[PDB]
Design a protein around this ligand. Structure first.
Ligand code: SF4
Ligand code: SF4
Ligand code: FCO
Ligand code: F3S
Ligand SMILES: [Mg+2]
Ligand SMILES: [Mg+2]
Ligand code: NI
Lengths: 544, 262
């Protein structure tokens, strides 16, 4: 049974660590279950204010600094945005290069999230010291694919390093970990903790390779610098020797996703099967990514190979089209001035007004994005449900696979465990597609190396750039007036997920997902972290 | 059990790109660094503990008998008593001040902590400042948006093993920031011959002509990008794009419009 105390009263977790940015979580607890929740973003920077009056060509360089974890994606969204405002259609090669860089970002970002951000909620690193490395090796050999890094000898060296570190008395990033001394909510056998810790360390090295692959096309990582209005600047990105090295690196990364990430994720899922019943929401949104036709936002929506759509009330039989006119943002419960509710992002307003800490009337620097009055979860889970529902063949195959492995029904995916599994599922799918996408661009680049189209700056226009970033549906919205930025609004995946209540008082996805969370130990409320982290929160992104 | 020097790493008004850049180090890799070289005692992005447990971990490090070095990522928002940027219910300016008071040394990772960065750009709604300005203390600046891990790790290791490296007038170690991007750029011969790309679609751009007419700020930017590269493979001008000047103080306002020289 799922451990749960009798605690009644408030719990505040600030800072939420192992995310990007500054998040405070307040909950009211009754008999060891969360009964109310608030998601309180604690930093404003105000990029939208800063962009006013500047050169539309500059937008991407500022907005990329919304966040360096999901680096690139804002430069991409801003470029798609200005591209739409100037009505330029990017060349085939630019579409491919921009989409390949997104794919590389998915691999980097998801790998780092699972291991370095999320795993410490499920893996008791210190318990790994209790494992017999020989028993751990046999365990790994029985479940996962065969590999030298899973041998007794490799696992023992990992355990030896960890033991010397722990005995030094300087626990560093493990100081005061919720798992120290044991914890009822941590279920993994010690052998599994050891295996996962080994891969955690490995993944620290492998994420370097994932970023190198990305940088071949992107110029550098973090903060790529290869995109321009009308396409891309990186002609060398189309030539043979770099793409061969790009392929070779992505293959190493994908071998690690398949040998370690997916098997670890499935092991965790197997042991924490009860988390398939906690942390569910009902509505899902995606703008789609990996389009075959990125000539306009309409075409992106229609031709995204990871499809776009809207699911409402968990109804997988009715995927609606995205209505970009129906998106708006409220600020009723946010730190912005009165009269800013119900704004479509073309009419967006960003007028900061702070009140005070834990004011239930105004408690976040995130706006509250709503779709026809409903909150929307975005991200890997949203994409997975939308893709599955529409019969996308890869998503149907891998999902049904995961479901069969775990012996759970598809309804168990509406949960924190689901949200976590979805992130792996789509990583595996990006991996399976890499070689075809790389080949497409290599073949295209050799025949004709056009990469940027000509374009003219209009006096007055508007545009929107859409992407499905690793955390979900991202949109940038520009109004151009006098050839300058008149208004520039970001609506970001973590804004959808972790914003506060909207104008009708309605909880955001993370706030709703938190209701019903069991708390085994109110001193060490890891269950709050499991649900928050499964959203892969980014407050830098969410507030900008 | 040799004692490893204590490092406290604070996140203020940042985007996390500096923390990301740091973990791309390969000499050493980040695991070797935190297991053998330093004791990274507070770091919000990766630490296990959260909430009060994380705050207590911070206070344990600040009270450590052996002292500690302070790494700061991000600028400090100072409007409204610093309340627009808070951790554990405390203004970032208050906590950074407290942590700086007893630090053996302060390393500002990134242009934000060094000079104020993106949120300081006009009209600066959060009245953000660089750390030296907000605290009135001397910092070792490792700027760029983000800096190369080679520059950050090299500075950390230099400070722990030798001492303060020689700094230029903007507080940047001369080991990494002593030379203009432009002086080491492979397209310098094109610059000298006045062979410029007039646009990104031009045949000139395809031939790898100089990017000066497209806004390249390499001639006024001190960094080691073309020499050391990023991620062992590339740098922005090699990827056909102009340098934005991102290791220069206040570049958001001094180097813009990025695609122009005006
Ligand atoms: S210097 Fe640039 S990359 Fe570092 S925190 Fe500031 S905005 Fe992000
Ligand atoms: S591309 Fe930039 S750094 Fe290189 S030679 Fe031209 S102006 Fe100098
Ligand atoms: N992925 C990502 Fe960052 C967030 N939320 C963006 O966009
Ligand atoms: S933009 Fe920055 S990373 Fe180097 S090339 Fe220019 S200084
Ligand atoms: Mg302790
Ligand atoms: Mg916004
Ligand atoms: Ni982000």
């Amino acid at each position: 049974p799922t451990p749960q105390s009798t605690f009644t009263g408030p719990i505040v977790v600030d800072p939420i660590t192992r995310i990007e940015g500054h998040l405070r979580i307040m909950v009211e607890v009754e008999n060891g279950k969360v009964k109310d929740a608030w998601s309180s973003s604690q930093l404003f920077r105000g990029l939208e204010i800063i962009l006013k009056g500047r050169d539309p060509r500059d937008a991407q360089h500022f907005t990329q600094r919304a966040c360096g974890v999901c680096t690139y994606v804002h430069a991409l969204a801003s470029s798609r945005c200005v591209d739409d405002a100037v009505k330029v259609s990017i060349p085939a090669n630019a579409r491919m290069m921009r989409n390949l860089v997104m794919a590389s970002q998915y691999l980097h970002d998801h790998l780092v999230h699972f291991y370095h951000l999320h795993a410490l909620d499920w893996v008791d690193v210190t318990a790994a010291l209790k494992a017999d490395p020989n028993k751990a090796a046999k365990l790994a050999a029985s479940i996962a694919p065969a590999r030298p890094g899973n041998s007794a000898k490799a696992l023992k060296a990992v355990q030896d390093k960890l033991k010397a570190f722990v005995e030094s008395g300087q626990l560093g990033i493990f100081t005061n970990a919720y798992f120290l001394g044991g914890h009822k909510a941590y279920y993994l056998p010690p052998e599994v903790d050891l295996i996962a810790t080994a891969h955690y360390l490995e993944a620290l090295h492998m994420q370097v390779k994932a970023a190198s692959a990305m940088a071949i096309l992107g110029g550098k990582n973090p903060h790529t610098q290869f995109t321009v209005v009308g396409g891309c600047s990186n002609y060398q990105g189309l030539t043979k020797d770099p793409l061969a090295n790009y392929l070779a690196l992505s293959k190493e990364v994908c071998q690690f996703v398949n040998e370690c990430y997916i098997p670890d994720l499935l092991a965790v899922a197997g042991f924490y099967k009860d988390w398939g019943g906690i942390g569910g929401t009902s509505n899902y949104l995606a703008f789609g990514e990996f389009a075959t036709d990125d000539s306009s936002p309409e075409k992106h929506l229609a031709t995204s190979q990871f499809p776009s759509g809207v699911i409402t009330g968990r109804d997988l039989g009715k995927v609606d089209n995205v209505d970009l006119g129906a998106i708006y943002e409220d600020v009723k419960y946010s730190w912005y001035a009165p009269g800013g509710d119900g704004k479509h992002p073309y009419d967006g307003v960003t007028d900061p007004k702070y009140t005070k800490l834990d004011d239930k009337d105004h408690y976040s620097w995130m706006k509250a994005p709503r779709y026809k009055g409903k909150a929307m979860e975005v991200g890997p889970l949203a994409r997975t449900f939308i893709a599955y529902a529409k019969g996308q063949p890869d998503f149907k195959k891998v999902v049904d696979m995961v479901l069969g492995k775990l012996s759970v029904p598809a309804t168990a995916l509406h949960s924190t465990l689901g949200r976590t599994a979805a992130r792996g599922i789509e990583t595996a799918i990006v991996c399976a597609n890499m070689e075809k996408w790389i080949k497409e661009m290599a073949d295209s680049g050799a025949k004709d190396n056009t990469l940027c189209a000509k374009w003219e700056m209009p006096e007055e226009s508007k545009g929107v750039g859409l992407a499905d970033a690793p955390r979900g549906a991202l949109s940038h919205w520009i109004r151009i007036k006098g050839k300058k930025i008149d208004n520039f609004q970001l609506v970001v995946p973590s804004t959808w997920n972790l914003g506060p209540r909207g104008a009708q008082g309605d909880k955001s996805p993370v706030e709703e997902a938190l209701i019903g969370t069991p708390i085994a130990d109110p001193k060490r409320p890891v269950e709050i972290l499991r649900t928050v982290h499964a959203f892969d929160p980014c407050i830098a992104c969410g507030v900008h | 059990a040799k004692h490893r020097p204590s490092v406290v790493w604070l996140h203020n008004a940042e985007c996390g790109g500096c923390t990301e850049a740091a973990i791309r180090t390969i000499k050493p890799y980040i695991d070797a660094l935190i297991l053998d070289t330093i004791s990274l005692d507070y770091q919000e992005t990766i630490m296990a503990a959260a909430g009060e447990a994380a705050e207590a971990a911070l206070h344990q490090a600040l009270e450590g008998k052996d002292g500690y070095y302070l790494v700061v990522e991000g600028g400090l928002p100072t409007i409204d008593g610093g309340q627009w940027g808070m951790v554990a219910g405390h203004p970032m300016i208050e906590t950074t001040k407290k942590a700086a008071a007893k630090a053996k040394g302060i390393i500002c990772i990134g242009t934000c902590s060094a000079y104020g960065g993106v949120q300081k750009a006009k009209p600066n709604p959060s009245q953000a400042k660089g750390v030296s300005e907000a605290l009135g203390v001397k910092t070792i600046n490792i700027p760029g948006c983000p800096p190369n891990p080679i520059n950050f790790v090299g500075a950390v290791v230099h400070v722990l093993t030798k001492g303060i490296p020689d700094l230029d007038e903007n507080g940047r170690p001369k080991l990494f920031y002593g030379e203009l991007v432009h002086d080491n750029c492979p397209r310098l011969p094109h610059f000298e011959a006045s062979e410029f790309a007039p646009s990104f679609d031009s045949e000139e751009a395809k031939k790898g002509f100089c990017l000066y007419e497209l806004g390249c700020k390499g001639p006024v930017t001190y960094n080691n990008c073309p020499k050391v590269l990023f991620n062992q493979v590339n740098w922005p001008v090699q990827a056909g794009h102009p340098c934005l000047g991102c290791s220069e103080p206040d570049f958001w306002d001094t180097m813009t419009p990025f695609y122009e020289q005006g």
